[PDB]
Design an enzyme around this catalytic site. Structure first.
Site, PDB file in Angstrom:
ATOM      1  NE  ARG A 137      -0.693   0.051   5.008  1.00 18.44           N
ATOM      2  CZ  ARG A 137      -0.022   0.961   5.720  1.00 18.44           C
ATOM      3  NH1 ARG A 137       0.202   2.174   5.239  1.00 18.44           N
ATOM      4  NH2 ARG A 137       0.427   0.649   6.925  1.00 18.44           N
ATOM      5  NE  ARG A 179      -4.473   5.774  -5.157  1.00 16.00           N
ATOM      6  CZ  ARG A 179      -4.627   7.094  -5.045  1.00 16.00           C
ATOM      7  NH1 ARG A 179      -4.032   7.923  -5.888  1.00 16.00           N
ATOM      8  NH2 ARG A 179      -5.385   7.584  -4.080  1.00 16.00           N
ATOM      9  CG  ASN A 238      -4.135   1.749  -5.188  1.00 17.07           C
ATOM     10  OD1 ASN A 238      -5.010   1.861  -6.045  1.00 17.07           O
ATOM     11  ND2 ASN A 238      -4.273   2.223  -3.960  1.00 17.07           N
ATOM     12  CG  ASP A 273     -10.210   9.231  -6.980  1.00 16.15           C
ATOM     13  OD1 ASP A 273      -9.795   9.597  -5.852  1.00 16.15           O
ATOM     14  OD2 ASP A 273      -9.479   8.742  -7.864  1.00 16.15           O
ATOM     15  NE  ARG A 321     -10.869  10.164  -0.646  1.00 16.20           N
ATOM     16  CZ  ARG A 321      -9.992   9.196  -0.913  1.00 16.20           C
ATOM     17  NH1 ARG A 321      -9.587   8.964  -2.153  1.00 16.20           N
ATOM     18  NH2 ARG A 321      -9.518   8.456   0.077  1.00 16.20           N
ATOM     19  CG  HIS A 326      -8.099   5.078  -7.745  1.00 20.01           C
ATOM     20  ND1 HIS A 326      -9.016   5.835  -7.042  1.00 20.01           N
ATOM     21  CD2 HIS A 326      -7.303   4.495  -6.823  1.00 20.01           C
ATOM     22  CE1 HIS A 326      -8.785   5.713  -5.750  1.00 20.01           C
ATOM     23  NE2 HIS A 326      -7.740   4.894  -5.590  1.00 20.01           N
ATOM     24  CB  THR A 367      -7.115   5.730   2.830  1.00 19.91           C
ATOM     25  OG1 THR A 367      -7.228   4.739   1.807  1.00 19.91           O
ATOM     26  CG2 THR A 367      -6.061   6.745   2.443  1.00 19.91           C
TER      27      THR A 367
END
Lengths: 331, 331, 331, 331
Positions: free
Chosen positions: C98, C105, C137, C165, C168, C192, C247
């Protein structure tokens, strides 16, 4: 000593005022469809039922109470006396005049005004800081009536309006395109009924204007005849009444959705009936459906939609009609 | 004119207080497991997060805030200051003294008291009418600490106690019998930890007393050794902590279940820590888990479980221990 | 005879295949947020957890199991061996490296490609008819990798993509206009990540085009700087990682949202990473987020969003970026 | 190029059968109450309605379909032809004959046998692997009837039995003690109706035997008259019919609770009518309510409740009476 006293030691006797109470007025199909939709969405810590027929009312109350084990609403009450409605956050009016066989439109409205001259003051007396949600038809005019009688500010008097009309538009839009209603966006505004306005410009999937793609969308030269969607929306209730005698579940689910936005203070946008003087060229005290932002103060805000000359003139023509009828009403 | 004012007409700017506000104090694994559980059960119209580490606190708030589209909690706030906790209906304390590698229980408690001497008065200041759910361990002693500091009546100070111990007991009971934990009935009472009393007399499926069916149930004569079920409950936290470093989901869901009962005024019975003076021949101001009725005034009532002489002696022995610690504390 | 035999009569020995089984690969903060979110949205009758850390893995399963009383998912299982995933409808891949603080990413490619060369064949072996929801990712490329390795048709390979996304974008859009995100419509498409495309021409409240009210919207001469909203969406993850290390919650809810549409066959439109070849003059096997219809066969259709010459160019750049990385991979 | 094909790019016109399909036979108040309760608990991906009244049937279908925006059940279908029921997991039967004033019990059962001789084979044809849930009265006998005609094994033929009776018993306990039904544990077994057996021995709150605290509980000289609680359970339906003309919500919620247990394989214990031969010295093929474990194969096990000699005699007499009727039916 009693078994309860042998079983349970008591710390505190006096219960508090209910914190998240809802009243439904009228226990017809619409009333009970609202109540079950509300009970199964866990929006209330207390539900109150009011209607004039005592046995039906106690019956419906006991049927709901017997399902308590499967619910999270710990107090369900009822009575003809509005003392049972004390300290309601939300009061939902489904009660109306049973339509006589050979009466005028003006007769029907004035019989509902006479019922509202009893209901609304009783609601105000026990729940003076409550939001009023008017379901009873004709919704636009009876929402004006509830407004005058109650003396409430315009934010706390809400007509169910074109909420279900818009939900039906999105369902039909969804069947034509093979898309769930949630992801199909479209607005039916103005007068709830035959003369409502489908806003072809704002009708979109994923922010893609169907009007921009298909310039003749909603015109008569439209080869796909998308006008018939709004014609279906406006003729839906008629078709369902034809088949099962009445409409029950769709309005029940839509009113529970409105209650959710109010009780939980979501500030979701709903096309509901709000006092519209000074907007879209209207100069009379009338209610029309426009996108309104619903929270714990009711209609805190509303969306100022851009409308063609045609659509401006259609909302103005609906207001002319509503004001026409309203000045003939005896309060 | 701003895009917002071009788009939205404002009816009233007037803003109100939170109606169903919950505050979680401590954004560790336990505190955030309470938050997401509570957030995804729609128990609150406003959630406040308070801890001493400001970056961690602003991280969790922002991470939750981004899930808003998928939630029904329109306001998520956070701050080191307790002014963000203002008007909380329920306040859950997970914050506490970090356990020192080796020290007495008298010392561990006193270091938590010094923390509750800052936390509790601040909570009381901004939310005087709120209910306190103490989760921080040792939960029984620190619920007494919260009670004393707050000055709150005994009904509005509740410790999570044996609520999860019982959830675990009913889960394990379920595995043995191949029934869902919902349809397996059993009660862990008294002091949360190794000393907890499994009430064998009240262990049943569909009201069938297992103790009557199997008289040896919970004794050392027991062929099936059912004393292991309670042993597993007592050693469950240890075994999970050994594997994933802590416990999160079980305690988060169990607190959210307590929160549901408080916020929705359900009046369900949970085994939670409550002032137990006068009961079971206990003479001191000690908090122990017994079946309590939880509503919008916290503990309205508790259940007097019929206990064996052996079961009473264990509760009285736990009270002598806890009061032995409590009387030597400095406030 | 045993107490269980004295209590319960057996009618049939368990002869049943899993019916609504979701697997979560990876028991990190992302995996367990997906896990609890899915468990608390009653989407599955069996949850299987798979990861390579046998202690952590068993500890998380036990902690979920310990709160089964508060859930309606009766079987929770775990194991490093993928025979636990057998007969899954949906396998959600969250495992692997991560983002660390300020890490792209697109810097997790080679590590997680290697991890997918282990995971995907194992998944396919035990659930050859399952839908793959890719979350690890960089999700766009790893969805293309999942597709190539599995041999699955493009409809049954979905990436989390711009679902979060976009969620958000609507949250920050909502904080500006004082509306609930649910009532704020607007799409972030493409990668993304940093190259994502905010489609200004689709942004609307109640079908009112913000681009048409405010022509400068999303350009540098916009005096309200609405481009800073899309900037915040791009920076959002970096901010949250900086503040709390990772996250977890928001992507957990975003993934459970995609899980709901798939497992319940809703046919809702989500911005998810899919094979975009032939569209917007893209010729390569590129995976980008465009609006897609999600059901029990995964991506049945997608929406051809109308893009401005500027928007289309900026999406072809996001496409070019990902073909550059995808083309040099080994299988 | 049609608007749809300009808007949407299709990948997959290939279509599959539904995975969690429920069918409700009969669209009376009871069947429609099941329909809305099941729709609002998100238990199905397809709901099929089947009745003989084609206009009423299509009416109720359209009324649910118009509320689809507020629901997560993407396909609702209706028809007189049982081909709409294809591939159902659970088929709920509410259709049947109401007893006429003079009519003997035998004649009423025989009229239902004749109705079931068309319904059951039609159900079995289109969903041979389904679970039958018989709600139609007399429930205990028509579960036997449905079992005979279907050829199904006894695990997949369930009568709703005393599920609601027991749920009513727990409400009445709750009001008497001031506790939520959820925390009030009591059981009504045997023949659904005036001969049902209230198991006084299994009556508890927090595992405290009320019969043990109050030795006279359930007898004639009981000073508190707790026998009257069972009388109320047995009369409450008659009292609700007398007040509102029928029973609706409580049976709809009760049936949806059983549907939850089955569709989600929970293995919760419910008092439901099952083939009871071999228990309490019952020699004949009769179905009575005992506490049964319900999952995705229906009744996998059942709990053997320890009954007083008096209580076994009441079930034995129920069996004799039921076999007196069933042995005379024409299949």
């Amino acid at each position: 000593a009693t078994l309860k006293d042998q079983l349970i030691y008591n710390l505190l006797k006096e219960e508090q005022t209910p914190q998240n109470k809802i009243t439904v007025v009228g226990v017809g199909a619409v009333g009970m469809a609202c109540a079950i939709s509300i009970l199964m969405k866990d929006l209330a810590d207390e539900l109150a039922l009011v209607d004039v027929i005592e046995d039906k009312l106690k019956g419906e109350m006991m049927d709901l109470q017997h399902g308590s084990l499967f619910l999270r609403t710990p107090k369900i009450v009822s009575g003809k006396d509005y003392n049972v409605t004390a300290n309601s956050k939300l009061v939902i009016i489904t009660a109306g005049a049973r339509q006589q066989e050979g009466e005028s439109r003006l007769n029907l409205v004035q019989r509902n005004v006479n019922i509202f001259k009893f209901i609304i003051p009783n609601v105000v007396k026990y729940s003076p800081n409550c939001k009023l949600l008017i379901v009873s038809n004709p919704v636009d005019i009876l929402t004006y009536v509830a407004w005058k009688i109650s003396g409430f500010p315009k934010n706390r008097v809400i007509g169910s309006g074109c909420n279900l009309d818009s939900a039906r538009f999105r369902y039909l839009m969804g069947e034509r395109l093979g898309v769930h209603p949630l992801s199909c966006h479209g607005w039916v505004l103005g007068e709830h009924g035959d003369s409502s306005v489908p806003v072809w410009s704002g009708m979109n999937v994923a922010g893609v204007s169907l009007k921009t793609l298909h310039p003749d969308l909603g015109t008569d030269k439209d080869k796909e005849q998308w006008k018939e969607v709004h014609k279906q929306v406006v003729e839906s209730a008629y078709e369902v009444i034809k088949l099962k005698g009445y409409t029950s579940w769709a309005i029940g689910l839509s009113v529970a959705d409105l209650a959710e936005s109010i009780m939980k203070n979501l500030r979701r946008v709903h096309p509901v009936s709000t006092m519209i003087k000074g907007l879209y060229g209207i100069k009379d005290d009338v209610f029309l459906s426009v996108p309104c932002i619903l929270g714990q103060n009711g209609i805190s805000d509303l969306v100022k939609v851009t409308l063609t000359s045609e659509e401006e003139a259609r909302l103005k023509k609906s207001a002319d009609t509503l004001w026409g009828i309203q000045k003939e009403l005896q309060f």
